[PDB]
Amino acid sequence: ASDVTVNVSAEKQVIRGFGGMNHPAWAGDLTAAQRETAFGNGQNQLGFSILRIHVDENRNNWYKEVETAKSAVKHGAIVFASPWNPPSDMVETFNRNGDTSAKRLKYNKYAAYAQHLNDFVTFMKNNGVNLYAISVQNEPDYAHEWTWWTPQEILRFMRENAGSINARVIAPESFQYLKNLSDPILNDPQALANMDILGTHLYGTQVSQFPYPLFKQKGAGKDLWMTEVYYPNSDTNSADRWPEALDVSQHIHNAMVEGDFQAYVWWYIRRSYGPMKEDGTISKRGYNMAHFSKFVRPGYVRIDATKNPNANVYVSAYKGDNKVVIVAINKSNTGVNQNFVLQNGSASNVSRWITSSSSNLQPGTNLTVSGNHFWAHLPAQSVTTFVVN
Ligand SMILES: O=C(O)[C@H]1O[C@H](O)[C@H](O)[C@@H](O)[C@@H]1O
Numbered sequence: 438a439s440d441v442t443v444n445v446s447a448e449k450q451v452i453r454g455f456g457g458m459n460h461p462a463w464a465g466d467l468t469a470a471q472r473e474t475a476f477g478n479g480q481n482q483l484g485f486s487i488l489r490i491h492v493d494e495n496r497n498n499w500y501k502e503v504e505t506a507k508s509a510v511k512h513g514a515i516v517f518a519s520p521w522n523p524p525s526d527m528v529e530t531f532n533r534n535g536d537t538s539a540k541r542l543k544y545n546k547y548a549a550y551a552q553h554l555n556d557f558v559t560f561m562k563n564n565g566v567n568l569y570a571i572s573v574q575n576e577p578d579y580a581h582e583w584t585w586w587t588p589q590e591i592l593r594f595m596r597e598n599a600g601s602i603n604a605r606v607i608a609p610e611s612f613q614y615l616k617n618l619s620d621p622i623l624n625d626p627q628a629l630a631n632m633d634i635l636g637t638h639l640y641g642t643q644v645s646q647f648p649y650p651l652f653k654q655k656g657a658g659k660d661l662w663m664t665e666v667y668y669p670n671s672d673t674n675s676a677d678r679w680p681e682a683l684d685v686s687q688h689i690h691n692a693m694v695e696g697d698f699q700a701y702v703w704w705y706i707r708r709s710y711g712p713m714k715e716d717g718t719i720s721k722r723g724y725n726m727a728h729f730s731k732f733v734r735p736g737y738v739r740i741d742a743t744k745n746p747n748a749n750v751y752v753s754a755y756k757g758d759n760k761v762v763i764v765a766i767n768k769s770n771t772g773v774n775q776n777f778v779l780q781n782g783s784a785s786n787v788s789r790w791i792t793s794s795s796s797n798l799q800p801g802t803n804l805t806v807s808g809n810h811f812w813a814h815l816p817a818q819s820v821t822t823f824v825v826n
Pocket residue numbers: 774775802812813814815
């Protein structure tokens with residue numbers, strides 16, 4: 438096999454959190470019990486530390502977001518918001534390559550759109566939810582069923598109107614991390630100054646497209662968030678399939694390590710293909726997320742670790758709060774013995790949780806670190822989260 442070397446001193450991105458979407462209008466609100474399951478970090482709870490909500494088109498609907506958002510804040514979660522459409526009175530039809538049903542924001546309602554976003558921020562404040570951030574537009578480059586924005590229109594808004602929104606601003610939320618939508622923001626000093634978080638989705642995105650050299654070059658002091666996805670699919674009642682659900686944790690691993698993302702946010706929280714089943718229990722996909730969310734808390738910084746030490750073995754590591762967390766995924770049908778070497782860190786005890794066939798985030802045997810390393814076995818088709826004290 439191999440060593441896995443974990444360098445406690447080689448710091449990467451600061452983690453903001455993991456979570457999912459709540460959408461009362463389309464999916465139905467979480468119940469009081471489901472809120473606890475979603476945002477508490479006790480036994481059989483997801484420990485989600487981010488909640489995404491939508492900015493409704495009609496401002497009389499806004500009240501519907503309050504209850505679940507207050508519950509998230511109550512649990513320590515940050516809340517952010519994404520809009521699908523501006524209010525109808527701000528929307529026009531136009532000719533987007535032959536298509537004439539296509540909708541966009543009216544060139545004279547940009548200021549009015551910003552004010553609508555600001556008013557939503559103020560509304561949530563008054564109901565006791567300090568929004569961490571707000572998005573310009575969800576998926577402006579795949580808006581068949583909502584509102585299109587071109588790179589240049591996005592640019593104009595970012596230069597001109599984003600500065601007026603009294604919160605952190607997320608842009609542009611491309612459906613597939615298409616760099617063309619985000620490149621103009623990065624190359625423009627004024628629009629860049631009004632961007633606080635570069636947000637993206639990863640639908641159809643290949644792992645070779647996860648990295649972003651231009652962001653590394655220009656995005657100093659800016660966050661990078663993965664604001665929506667489901668993976669590997671939305672097949673009905675798929676959320677317990679094993680070993681398929683193990684793809685979720687592999688996906689998060691890739692976003693963390695290849696994409697350097699600071700937030701990872703699933704689509705609908707409760708859903709037959711989601712982290713939480715319609716009966717209110719955590720699915721195998723949910724336990725794959727929990728292997729991060731419950732242990733990599735906000736403020737933790739990713740650290741360097743041998744990322745692929747064996748065929749089908751994937752490792753990422755994080756530190757925070759006198760702990761080092763290691764997430765080790767085995768996608769093979771062979772159990773592997775792994776030696777974990779800790780550089781620049783003293784440690785004694787290691788606890789662990791395993792998800793595998795017939796076990797959900799279930800405690801394994803404690804291990805001892807002696808001479809800066811410890812051996813541990815990674816079962817076939819499993820994800821283990823180690824916590825090093
Ligand atoms: O992880 C496990 O269960 C076991 O496998 C490792 O290979 C290690 O050598 C053992 O000491 C440990 O108890």
